[PDB]
């Protein structure tokens, strides 16, 4: 049966001529080929469990979300083809279209592109004062306490990440709880000898509703930064409580209430492993010293255990003064975004595409890359001018209730496959220290990043907003671009999956080398990556640490292996200290965030080896 | 651009020779025209509502093309595919009605559940986590408003609460005993967690609607028969705790009452069930009670029965028990899908010819009971390949799940058949006419209880509130027939919820007629005046129960400001500003009257 999706004819010759230019196996792999028969679709799913069941569940629930996500991307497609031809002309739309579909460009919740932004992390300040404003058909008073208080982050929190594609960021939860925890011991809801409790059950309800999820088998996105008294005196100068109270007058009332959770967070995992909320915490450090040791040998500390704390190291609070028409501020796509910082659109440049195109000319490589760079930023200009359509047509609540702001949001130039792009340029090579980048690979990965930064920062005067650079966690672009490459070049591209980190996780090389790489090059993308590794005492990490921050990496972490048995306990080795019973999974850092390797491995076979 | 779905050639042909039939615009009535166009859609869509309703109502046409199609294979694997076929052409020109047609081949309608298994196991169908059972009134809460949410994502229709007070009690006593509450603010703390609750489920997460949930006022008779045998975490028997729960109960209707002032709410829909024989109410105290808190808003739905039988020991093979869609369904009873017959569409074939009109009834019936159990059937494999985690953690309970054949349009039918009047009290049924409705009925109820033995499971018949059937039918009605179907809108009340008539008619044919579809209706009565005593709100209460009503209830026109106190009149006694909508139960639970009347204008003229 055939049904009828109302295009402009253009467009219609144009995916005509790129189905006969490149074949039904680019559309199959780009989700525009058999995903798009809602028959096919249904009954391949219908039948995953069993599948499932023989090999290693999903619910209904799943089915509604998945079933459109092809036609939406179609029509995402289309509707960012059809504002590119109008502000660029046609060309460049059509250009677009081409390397979205063909894999020389990845754009990022693409079924979600024409309709709704991508991340931001919020300030809680507006929920404390107003309620549930963007909630239109009930009007709803302002917490009071802190339960009601943690009713509405959980629900804000659920609502935005319907209302968003990526994370939910909370920076500022704890600022807000004390002063909720505060007024209930003071007014007595909270009996004094049951204060920590109290606290700890709240820790409890949020962290655990955090990790059901109602819909779909996963959680939202969420992260939690630890402030060191740095940010939280940057942040918060001027600001007051709901009481009149300064809130800079009681920074060690919130730093403790900090160290409470990461206290009560360490030890819940024993009784129940569990990903969300992303640890990350944000600390002062400069000429070889933090500037908030207390915080920092506490996160070292507590850290021993799990190491599921992400450090995130800056040398300066300028670029949040005050912040309770240039845009500073970090965005990190999986930890440590700056208060009221975001992105509302990823598009990412398949680098290796480049190189394969470039067959190792350097000079050629750079022009193709400056190219593919300004048609990113016009597309992103176009969802952009998508995005503020959306919001007028009061379809984007969060926008009009000063929660997402969209002049503190960027527009993101992802990078991806930086290690295999050298590879195939023959810029790597592998020495007593493991593999690495030759010294001319340095230079060239050095002109790489510096031209796209050239670029981005060309952005601003270009097109009146601020774009920024990450090199982008890629669970499944950087399968599916190494897909494409491989259908496009054959034996020449030798990878299964591009990278995610400037020297491959699991490569076989000197940390030294990964701290150094990492320490050149997180910069020229303002934090937008990470170094996360896989592995002494309480002083030698602490050392680590201090060394990894003098070399100037701005976002790292360290990986252990957490066992966990059937019944959900953390703990190391085979065998379960609370019950007794066998280690079935592990949780890891993969791509920055620890999950549980089957969820991942299932994930990735499945967009991998499919059908 | 064309985009192939992949269908049986023979379905192919079906539907290609319906449309030649019936035409595109029946097609485009059905939800099956243009909507299946993505771009149109979404254009139209796109210019209240925010995104996370587009993404559900993106899939709809789509989801409901694949479940006619499934429900079309497994119909003609039972039955051969003539009854598919047949069926196929019944949904698609309006002689039958699928509800939820969106889900039918993918999860099931509704279920009044007990609580027990979330306060003993936690949230076991929640796989990806391992949750303790709760051991605190903070976290049972968490744990109900997560139960209701994820059940609002596994069927279609409501999640029935019916004893939330039973369990709700354990917990408040646990956190008195053990030092949690302080007794100055027990009432604070139970009132603190009625609001969080109540709340929650009025606060849309996802789309502008709520899920559609119920609570149950059990007397003191339900109570004890429900939880005979029954014991609390702690050891210590339900029972012994009747009076602990009624109070509780009690609270939650008293707050409530009061709650609407500071601002008005939908849910949960809330029922009184009273057990009522002889002419007098078994527990008076709960009756009268109800009665009392009802004065002000009328919030209440009135549910009457004369046995406990149905819901004796529940806790602890034909199906018996109440099953409605609007409110007072029994615990642990649900359906897994409603197929309504389109009564004013045989009226109209048949001529005004009630014989071949009852020929025609009985054959759609069969028909629908087909249909029924091949939804059944698709709902037993949804179950086997994992997709359906309440039936396998035993909340969702399938042998305790109707199939439902409702019926829409009695009056107009009867109507169109010539059978309806107007003397001295008002608009009203003749003789023959009533007769017939008995007829009707009867027919219905005979089919239903053969399906027993036919299909190895129970079916039911409601009334349905047909918020949107009732419109669309009629639309259909219209197409085909033109001038011989003169009503915008099919009724979901025996008598028109609107049409002039004396109330003791509407009492009368509520008495002849709930008892048929077994308490699968609902009477709500316009007030003319509010009462002027309770004694007298109460004597028509107890006059109701005596002529054979099973639910009922008086309805109210809540006023409503632009900050959302409810009041009566003009000016908003909170804040002074003005009046700008009315809260009145439609079709039996209260709601907004602007949306549903934008909602409808909206079917009726696109
Ligand atoms: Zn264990
Ligand atoms: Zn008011």
Not at 118 to 135: H, M, Q, R, S
Not at 145 to 167: D, P, R, Y
Not at 462 to 491: M, S
Not at 510 to 519: A, H
Request: aromatic content about 12%; some cysteine; charged content about 25%.
């Amino acid at each position: 049966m055939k049904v009828q999706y109302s295009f402009e004819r253009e467009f219609e010759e144009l995916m005509s001529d790129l189905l006969s230019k490149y074949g039904y196996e680019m559309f199959q792999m780009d989700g525009l080929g058999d995903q798009l028969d809602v028959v096919k679709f249904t009954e391949d799913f219908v039948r995953r469990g069993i599948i499932e069941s023989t090999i290693d569940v999903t619910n209904i629930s799943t089915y509604f979300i998945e079933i459109s996500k092809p036609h939406t991307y179609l029509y995402s497609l289309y509707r960012i083809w059809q504002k590119m031809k109008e502000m660029f002309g046609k060309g460049v739309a059509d250009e677009f279209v081409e390397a979205q579909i063909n894999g020389a460009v990845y754009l990022h919740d693409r079924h979600h592109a024409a309709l709704m932004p991508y991340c931001f992390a919020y300030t809680l300040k507006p929920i404390v004062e107003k309620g549930l404003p963007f909630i239109k058909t009930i009007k709803s008073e302002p917490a009071k306490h802190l339960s009601t208080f943690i009713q509405h982050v959980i629900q804000f929190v659920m609502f935005a990440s319907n209302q968003s594609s990526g994370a939910v960021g909370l920076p500022d939860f704890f600022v807000w709880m004390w002063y909720f925890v505060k007024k209930d011991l003071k007014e007595g809801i909270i009996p004094r000898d049951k204060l920590d409790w109290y606290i700890e059950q709240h820790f409890q309800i949020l962290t655990y509703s955090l990790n059901q999820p109602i819909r779909t088998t996963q959680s939202p996105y969420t992260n939690f930064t630890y402030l060191d008294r740095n940010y939280i005196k940057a942040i918060f100068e001027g600001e007051r409580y709901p009481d009149g109270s300064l809130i800079t007058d009681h920074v060690e009332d919130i730093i403790a209430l900090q160290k409470h959770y990461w206290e009560w967070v360490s030890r819940e995992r024993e009784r129940q492993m569990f990903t969300f909320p992303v640890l990350t915490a944000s600390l002062l450090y400069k000429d070889g010293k933090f500037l908030d040791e207390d915080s920092a040998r506490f996160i070292n500390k507590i850290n021993m255990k799990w190491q599921d704390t992400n450090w995130y190291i800056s040398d300066s609070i300028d670029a949040v003064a005050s912040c309770c028409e240039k845009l500073k501020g970090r965005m990190n796509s999986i930890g440590g975004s700056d208060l009221n910082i975001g992105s509302f659109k990823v598009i990412t440049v398949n680098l290796p595409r480049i190189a394969l195109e470039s067959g190792g000319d350097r000079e050629k490589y750079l022009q193709i890359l400056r190219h593919r760079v300004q048609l990113i930023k016009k597309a992103l200009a176009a969802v952009r001018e998508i995005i503020k359509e959306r919001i007028s047509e009061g379809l984007l609540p969060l926008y009009e209730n000063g929660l997402m702001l969209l002049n503190r949001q960027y527009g993101t130039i992802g990078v991806t496959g930086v290690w295999e792009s050298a590879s195939i340029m023959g810029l790597t090579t592998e020495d007593i220290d493991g593999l690495k980048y030759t010294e001319e690979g340095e230079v060239f990965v050095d002109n790489v990043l510096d031209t796209i930064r050239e670029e981005a920062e060309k952005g601003y005067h270009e097109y009146g907003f601020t774009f920024n650079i990450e090199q982008v966690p890629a669970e499944k672009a950087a399968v599916t671009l190494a897909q494409k490459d491989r259908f496009l070049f054959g034996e020449k591209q030798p990878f299964e999956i591009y990278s995610n980190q400037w020297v491959p996780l699991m490569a076989n090389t000197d940390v030294l080398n990964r701290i150094r790489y990492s320490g050149k090059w997180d910069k020229k993308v303002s934090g937008g990556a990470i170094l996360h590794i896989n592995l002494k005492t309480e002083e030698e990490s602490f050392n680590m640490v201090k060394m990894i921050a003098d070399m100037g990496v701005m976002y790292f972490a360290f990986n252990t292996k957490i066992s966990v048995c059937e019944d959900g306990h953390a703990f190391y080795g085979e065998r379960c200290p609370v019950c007794g019973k066998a280690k079935v999974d592990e949780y890891m850092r993969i791509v920055g965030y620890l999950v549980p390797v089957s969820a991942f491995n299932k994930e990735r076979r499945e967009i991998e080896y499919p059908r």
